[PDB]
CSV table of N, CA, C and O in Angstrom, one decimal:
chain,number,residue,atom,x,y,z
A,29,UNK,N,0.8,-1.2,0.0
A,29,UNK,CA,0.0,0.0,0.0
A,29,UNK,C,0.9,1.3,0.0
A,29,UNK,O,2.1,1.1,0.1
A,30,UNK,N,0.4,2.6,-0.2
A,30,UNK,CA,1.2,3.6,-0.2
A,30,UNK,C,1.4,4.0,1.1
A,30,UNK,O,0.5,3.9,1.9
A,31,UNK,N,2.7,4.4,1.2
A,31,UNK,CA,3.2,5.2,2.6
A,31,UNK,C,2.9,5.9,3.5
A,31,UNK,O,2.1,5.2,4.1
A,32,UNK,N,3.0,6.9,3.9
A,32,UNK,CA,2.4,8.0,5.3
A,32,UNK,C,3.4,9.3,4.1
A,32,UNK,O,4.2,9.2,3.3
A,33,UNK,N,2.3,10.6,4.9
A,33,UNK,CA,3.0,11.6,3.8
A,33,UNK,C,4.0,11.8,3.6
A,33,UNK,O,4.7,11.4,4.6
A,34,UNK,N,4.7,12.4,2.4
A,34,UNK,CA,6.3,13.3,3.1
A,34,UNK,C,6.3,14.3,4.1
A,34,UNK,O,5.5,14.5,4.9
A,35,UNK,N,7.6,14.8,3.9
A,35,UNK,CA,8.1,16.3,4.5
A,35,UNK,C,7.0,17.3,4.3
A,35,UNK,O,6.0,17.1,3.7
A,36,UNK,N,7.5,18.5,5.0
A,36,UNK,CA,7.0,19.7,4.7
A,36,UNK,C,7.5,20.2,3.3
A,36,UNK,O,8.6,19.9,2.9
A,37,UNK,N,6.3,21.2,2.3
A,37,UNK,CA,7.8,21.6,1.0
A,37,UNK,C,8.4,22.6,1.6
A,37,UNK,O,8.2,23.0,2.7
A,38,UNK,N,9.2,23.1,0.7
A,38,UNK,CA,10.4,24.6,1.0
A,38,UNK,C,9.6,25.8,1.4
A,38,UNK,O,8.9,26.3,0.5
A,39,UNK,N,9.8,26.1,2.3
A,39,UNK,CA,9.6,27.7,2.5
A,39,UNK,C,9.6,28.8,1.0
A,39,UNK,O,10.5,28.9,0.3
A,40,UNK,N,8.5,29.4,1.0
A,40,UNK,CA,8.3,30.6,0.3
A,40,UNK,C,9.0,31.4,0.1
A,40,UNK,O,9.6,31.9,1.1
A,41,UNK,N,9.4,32.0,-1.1
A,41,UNK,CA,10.3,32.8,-1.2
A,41,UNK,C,10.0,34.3,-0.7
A,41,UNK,O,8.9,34.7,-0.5
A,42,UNK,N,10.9,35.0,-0.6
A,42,UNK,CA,10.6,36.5,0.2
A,42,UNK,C,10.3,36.9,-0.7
A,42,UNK,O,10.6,36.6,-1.9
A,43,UNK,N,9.4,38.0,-0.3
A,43,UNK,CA,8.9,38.9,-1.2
A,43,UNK,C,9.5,40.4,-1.7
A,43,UNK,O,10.3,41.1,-0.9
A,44,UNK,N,9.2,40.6,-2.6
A,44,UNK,CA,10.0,41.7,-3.5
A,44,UNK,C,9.7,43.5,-2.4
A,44,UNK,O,8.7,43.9,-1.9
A,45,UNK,N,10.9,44.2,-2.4
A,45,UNK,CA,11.4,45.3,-2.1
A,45,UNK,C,9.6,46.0,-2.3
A,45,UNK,O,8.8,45.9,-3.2
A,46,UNK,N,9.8,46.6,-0.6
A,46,UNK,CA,8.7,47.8,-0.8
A,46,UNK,C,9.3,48.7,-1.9
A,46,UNK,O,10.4,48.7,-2.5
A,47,UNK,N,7.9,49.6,-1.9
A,47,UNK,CA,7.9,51.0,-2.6
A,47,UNK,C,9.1,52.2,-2.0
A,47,UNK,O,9.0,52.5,-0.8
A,48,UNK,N,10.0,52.7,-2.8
A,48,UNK,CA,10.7,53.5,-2.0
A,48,UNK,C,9.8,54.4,-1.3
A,48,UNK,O,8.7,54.5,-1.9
A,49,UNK,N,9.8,55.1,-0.2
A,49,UNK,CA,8.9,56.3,0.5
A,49,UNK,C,8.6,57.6,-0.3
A,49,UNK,O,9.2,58.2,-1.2
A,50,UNK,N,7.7,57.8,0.2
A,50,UNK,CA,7.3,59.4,-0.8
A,50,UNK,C,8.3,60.7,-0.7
A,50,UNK,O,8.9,60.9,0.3
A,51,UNK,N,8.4,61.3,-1.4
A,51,UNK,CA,9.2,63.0,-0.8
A,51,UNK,C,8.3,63.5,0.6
A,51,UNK,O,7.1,63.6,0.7
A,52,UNK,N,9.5,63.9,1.7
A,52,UNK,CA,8.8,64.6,2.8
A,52,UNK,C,8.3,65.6,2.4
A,52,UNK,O,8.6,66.1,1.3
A,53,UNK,N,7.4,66.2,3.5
A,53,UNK,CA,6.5,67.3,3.2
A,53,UNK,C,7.7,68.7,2.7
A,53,UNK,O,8.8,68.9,3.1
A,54,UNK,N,6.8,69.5,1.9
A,54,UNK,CA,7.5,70.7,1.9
A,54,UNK,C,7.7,71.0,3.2
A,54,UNK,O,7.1,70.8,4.3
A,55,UNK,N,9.3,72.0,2.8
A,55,UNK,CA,9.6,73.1,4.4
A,55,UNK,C,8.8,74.0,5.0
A,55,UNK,O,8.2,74.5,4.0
A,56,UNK,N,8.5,74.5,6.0
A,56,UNK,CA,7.5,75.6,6.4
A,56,UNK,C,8.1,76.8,5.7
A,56,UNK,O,9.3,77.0,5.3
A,57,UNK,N,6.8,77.6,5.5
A,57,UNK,CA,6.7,78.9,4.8
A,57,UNK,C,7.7,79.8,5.0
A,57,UNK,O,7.7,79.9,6.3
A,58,UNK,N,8.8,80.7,4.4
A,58,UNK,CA,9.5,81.6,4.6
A,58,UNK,C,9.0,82.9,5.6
A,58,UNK,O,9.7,83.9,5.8
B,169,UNK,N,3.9,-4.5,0.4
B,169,UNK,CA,4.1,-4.0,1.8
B,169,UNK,C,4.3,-2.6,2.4
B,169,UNK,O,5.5,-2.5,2.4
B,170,UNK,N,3.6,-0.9,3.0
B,170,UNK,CA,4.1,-0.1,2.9
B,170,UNK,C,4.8,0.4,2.4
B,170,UNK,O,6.0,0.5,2.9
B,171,UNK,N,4.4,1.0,1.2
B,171,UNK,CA,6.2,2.0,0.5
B,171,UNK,C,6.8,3.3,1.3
B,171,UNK,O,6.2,3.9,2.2
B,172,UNK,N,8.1,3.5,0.8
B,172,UNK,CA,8.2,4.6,2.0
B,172,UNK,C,7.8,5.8,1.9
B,172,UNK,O,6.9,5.9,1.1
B,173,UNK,N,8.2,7.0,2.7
B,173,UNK,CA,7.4,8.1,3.1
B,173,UNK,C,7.2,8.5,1.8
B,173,UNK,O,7.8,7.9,0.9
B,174,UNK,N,6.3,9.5,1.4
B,174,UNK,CA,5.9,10.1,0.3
B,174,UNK,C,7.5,11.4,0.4
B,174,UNK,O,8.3,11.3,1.3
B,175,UNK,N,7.5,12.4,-0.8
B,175,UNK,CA,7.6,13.4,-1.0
B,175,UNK,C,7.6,14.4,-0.2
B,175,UNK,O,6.6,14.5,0.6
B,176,UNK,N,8.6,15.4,-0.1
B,176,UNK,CA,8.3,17.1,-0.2
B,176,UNK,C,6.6,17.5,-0.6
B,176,UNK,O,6.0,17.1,-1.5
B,177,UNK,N,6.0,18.6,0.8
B,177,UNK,CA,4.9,19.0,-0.2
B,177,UNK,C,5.6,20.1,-1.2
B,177,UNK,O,6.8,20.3,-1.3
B,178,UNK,N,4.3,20.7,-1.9
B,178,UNK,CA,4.5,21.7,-2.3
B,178,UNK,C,5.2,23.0,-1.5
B,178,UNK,O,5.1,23.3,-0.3
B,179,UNK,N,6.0,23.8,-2.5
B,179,UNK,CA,6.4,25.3,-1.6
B,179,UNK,C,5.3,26.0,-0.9
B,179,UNK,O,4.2,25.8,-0.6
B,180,UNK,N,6.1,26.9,-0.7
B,180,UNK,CA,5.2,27.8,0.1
B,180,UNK,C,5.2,29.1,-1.0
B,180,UNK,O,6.2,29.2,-1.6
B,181,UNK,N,4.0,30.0,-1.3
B,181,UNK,CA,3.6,30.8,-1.5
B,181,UNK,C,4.6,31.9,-1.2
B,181,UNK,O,4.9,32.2,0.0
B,182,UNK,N,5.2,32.5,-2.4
B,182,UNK,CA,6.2,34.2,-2.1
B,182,UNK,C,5.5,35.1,-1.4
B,182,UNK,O,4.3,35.4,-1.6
B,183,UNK,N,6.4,35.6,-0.5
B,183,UNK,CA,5.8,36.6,0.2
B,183,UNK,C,5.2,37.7,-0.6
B,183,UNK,O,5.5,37.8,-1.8
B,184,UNK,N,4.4,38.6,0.0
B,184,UNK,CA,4.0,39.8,0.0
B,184,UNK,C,5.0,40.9,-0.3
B,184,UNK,O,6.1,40.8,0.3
B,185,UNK,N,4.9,42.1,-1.2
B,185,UNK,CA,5.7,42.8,-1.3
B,185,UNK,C,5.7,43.6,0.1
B,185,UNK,O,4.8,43.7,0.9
B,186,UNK,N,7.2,44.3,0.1
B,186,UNK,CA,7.5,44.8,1.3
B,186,UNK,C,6.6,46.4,1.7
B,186,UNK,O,6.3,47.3,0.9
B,187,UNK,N,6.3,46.5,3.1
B,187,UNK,CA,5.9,47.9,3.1
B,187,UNK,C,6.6,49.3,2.7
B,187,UNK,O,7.7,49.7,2.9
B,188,UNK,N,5.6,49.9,2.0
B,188,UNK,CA,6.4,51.0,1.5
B,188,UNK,C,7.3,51.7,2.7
B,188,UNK,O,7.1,51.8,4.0
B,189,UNK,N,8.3,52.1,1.9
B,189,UNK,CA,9.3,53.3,2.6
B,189,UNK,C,8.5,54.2,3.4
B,189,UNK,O,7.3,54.3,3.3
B,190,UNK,N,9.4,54.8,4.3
B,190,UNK,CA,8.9,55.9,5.0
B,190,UNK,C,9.3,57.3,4.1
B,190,UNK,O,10.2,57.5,3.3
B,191,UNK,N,8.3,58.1,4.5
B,191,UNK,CA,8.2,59.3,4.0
B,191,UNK,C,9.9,59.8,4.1
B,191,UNK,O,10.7,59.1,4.7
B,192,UNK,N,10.3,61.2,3.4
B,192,UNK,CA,11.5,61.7,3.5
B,192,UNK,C,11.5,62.6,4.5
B,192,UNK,O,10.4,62.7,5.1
B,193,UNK,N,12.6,63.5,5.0
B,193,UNK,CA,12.5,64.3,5.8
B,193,UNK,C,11.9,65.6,5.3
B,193,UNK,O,12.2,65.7,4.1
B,194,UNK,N,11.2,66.6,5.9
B,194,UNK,CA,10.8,67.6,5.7
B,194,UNK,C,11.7,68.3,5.1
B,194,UNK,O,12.9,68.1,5.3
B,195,UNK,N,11.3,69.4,4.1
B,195,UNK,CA,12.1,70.2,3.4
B,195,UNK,C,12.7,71.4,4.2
B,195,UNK,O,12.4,71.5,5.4
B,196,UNK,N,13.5,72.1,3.9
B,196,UNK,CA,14.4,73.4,4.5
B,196,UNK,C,12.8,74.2,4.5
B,196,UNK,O,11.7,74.0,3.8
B,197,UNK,N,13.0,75.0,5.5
B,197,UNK,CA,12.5,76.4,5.9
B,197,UNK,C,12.7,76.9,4.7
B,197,UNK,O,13.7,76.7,4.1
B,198,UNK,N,11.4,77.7,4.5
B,198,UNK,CA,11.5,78.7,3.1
B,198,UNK,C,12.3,80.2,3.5
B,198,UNK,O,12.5,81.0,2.6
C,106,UNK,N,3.0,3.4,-4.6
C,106,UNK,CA,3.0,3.5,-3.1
C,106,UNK,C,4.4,4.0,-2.5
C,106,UNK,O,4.8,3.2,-1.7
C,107,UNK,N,5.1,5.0,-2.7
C,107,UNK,CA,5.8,6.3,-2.0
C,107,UNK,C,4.7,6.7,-1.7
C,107,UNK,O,3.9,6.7,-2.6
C,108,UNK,N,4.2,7.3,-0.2
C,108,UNK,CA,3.0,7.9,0.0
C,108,UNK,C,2.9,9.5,-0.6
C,108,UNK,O,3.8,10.1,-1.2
C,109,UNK,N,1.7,10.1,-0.1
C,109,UNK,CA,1.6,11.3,-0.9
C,109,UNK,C,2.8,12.7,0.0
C,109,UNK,O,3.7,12.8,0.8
C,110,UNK,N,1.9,13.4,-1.2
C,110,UNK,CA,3.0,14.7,-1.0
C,110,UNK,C,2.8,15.4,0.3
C,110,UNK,O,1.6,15.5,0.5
C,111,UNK,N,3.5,15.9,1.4
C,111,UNK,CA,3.7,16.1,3.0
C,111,UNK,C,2.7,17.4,3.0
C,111,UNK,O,1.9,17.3,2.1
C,112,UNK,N,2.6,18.4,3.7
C,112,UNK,CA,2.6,19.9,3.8
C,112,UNK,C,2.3,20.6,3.0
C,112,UNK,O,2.7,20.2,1.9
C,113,UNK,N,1.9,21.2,3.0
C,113,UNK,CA,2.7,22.8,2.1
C,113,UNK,C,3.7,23.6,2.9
C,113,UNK,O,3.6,23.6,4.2
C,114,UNK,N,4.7,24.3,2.3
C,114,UNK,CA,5.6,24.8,2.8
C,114,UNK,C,5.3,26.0,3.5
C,114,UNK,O,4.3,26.7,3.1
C,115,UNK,N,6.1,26.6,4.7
C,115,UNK,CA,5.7,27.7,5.5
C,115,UNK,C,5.5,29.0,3.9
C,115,UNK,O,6.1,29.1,2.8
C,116,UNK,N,4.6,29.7,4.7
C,116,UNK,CA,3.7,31.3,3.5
C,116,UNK,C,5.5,31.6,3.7
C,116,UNK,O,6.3,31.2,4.6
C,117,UNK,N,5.7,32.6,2.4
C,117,UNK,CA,7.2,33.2,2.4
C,117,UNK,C,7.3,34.4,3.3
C,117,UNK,O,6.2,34.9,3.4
C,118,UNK,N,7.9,34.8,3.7
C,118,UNK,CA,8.6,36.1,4.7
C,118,UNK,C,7.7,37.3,3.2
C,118,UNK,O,7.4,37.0,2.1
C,119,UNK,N,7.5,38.5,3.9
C,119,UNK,CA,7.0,39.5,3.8
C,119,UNK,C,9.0,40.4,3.0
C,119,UNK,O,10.1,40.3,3.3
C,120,UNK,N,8.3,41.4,1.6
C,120,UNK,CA,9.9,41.7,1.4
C,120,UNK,C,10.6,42.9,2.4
C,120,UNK,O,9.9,43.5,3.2
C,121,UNK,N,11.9,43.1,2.2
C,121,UNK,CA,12.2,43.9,2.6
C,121,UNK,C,11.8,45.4,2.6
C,121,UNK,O,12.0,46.2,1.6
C,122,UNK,N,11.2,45.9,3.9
C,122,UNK,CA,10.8,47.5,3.8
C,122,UNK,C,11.5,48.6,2.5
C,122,UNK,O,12.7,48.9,2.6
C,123,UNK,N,10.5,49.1,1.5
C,123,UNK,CA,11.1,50.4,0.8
C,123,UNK,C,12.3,51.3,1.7
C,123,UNK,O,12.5,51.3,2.9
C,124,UNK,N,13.0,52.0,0.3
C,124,UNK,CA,13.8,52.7,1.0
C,124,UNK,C,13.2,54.2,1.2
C,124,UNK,O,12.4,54.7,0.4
C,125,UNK,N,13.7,54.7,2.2
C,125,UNK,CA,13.2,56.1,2.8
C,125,UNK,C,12.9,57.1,1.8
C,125,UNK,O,13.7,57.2,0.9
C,126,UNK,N,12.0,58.0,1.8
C,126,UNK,CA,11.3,58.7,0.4
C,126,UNK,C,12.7,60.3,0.6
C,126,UNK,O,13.4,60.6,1.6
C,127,UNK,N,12.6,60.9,-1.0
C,127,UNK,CA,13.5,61.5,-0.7
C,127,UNK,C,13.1,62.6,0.4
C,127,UNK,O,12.1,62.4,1.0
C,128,UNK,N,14.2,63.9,0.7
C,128,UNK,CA,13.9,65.0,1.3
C,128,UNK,C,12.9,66.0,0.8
C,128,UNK,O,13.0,66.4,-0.4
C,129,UNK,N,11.9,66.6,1.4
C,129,UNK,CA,10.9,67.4,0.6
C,129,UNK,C,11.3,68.7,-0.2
C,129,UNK,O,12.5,68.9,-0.2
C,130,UNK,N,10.6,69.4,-0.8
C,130,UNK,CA,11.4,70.6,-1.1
C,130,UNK,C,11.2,71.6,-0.1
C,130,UNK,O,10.4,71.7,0.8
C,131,UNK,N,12.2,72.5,-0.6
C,131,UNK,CA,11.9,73.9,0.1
C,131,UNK,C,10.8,74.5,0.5
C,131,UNK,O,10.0,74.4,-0.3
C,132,UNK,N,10.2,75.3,1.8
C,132,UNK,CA,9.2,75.7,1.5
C,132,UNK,C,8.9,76.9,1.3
C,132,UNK,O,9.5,77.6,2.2
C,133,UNK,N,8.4,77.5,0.5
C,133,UNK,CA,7.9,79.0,0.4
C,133,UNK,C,8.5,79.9,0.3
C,133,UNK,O,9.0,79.8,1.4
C,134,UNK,N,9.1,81.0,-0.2
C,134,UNK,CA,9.9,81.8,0.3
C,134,UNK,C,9.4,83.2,1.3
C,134,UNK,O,9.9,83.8,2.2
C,135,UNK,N,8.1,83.2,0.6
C,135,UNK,CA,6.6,83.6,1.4
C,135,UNK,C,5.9,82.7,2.0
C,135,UNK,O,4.9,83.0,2.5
C-alpha cells in the first residue's frame, strides 16, 4: 500500500522590495 | 508492503511585497 | 506506493521595507 505523507515543501520565497517612501512634506513657509 | 514516506509538499507561497518606505524628511524652511 | 505529498511549505517572509522617500522641497519663500 502507499506510505504515510512526506516532508513539509520549502519555505516561500521572500517577497520583492517595498515602494521606496514618498518626498517629505515641503519646508515651512518663509 | 508499505512503500516509504511520500515526498516534499509543495512550496510555500512568495511573500507579499515589502511595506512602502517611509516618508522623506521635511524640506528646508522657506 | 511512496506515499503522498507532505505539507505545504511555511507562506514566504513579507519583502524587505522600501527605501526612505527622498527629502521634501523647500518651503515658500513667502
Amino acid at each position: 500500500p502507499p506510505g504515510p505523507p512526506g516532508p513539509p515543501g520549502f519555505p516561500g520565497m521572500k517577497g520583492h522590495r517595498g515602494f521606496d517612501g514618498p518626498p517629505g512634506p515641503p519646508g515651512p513657509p518663509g
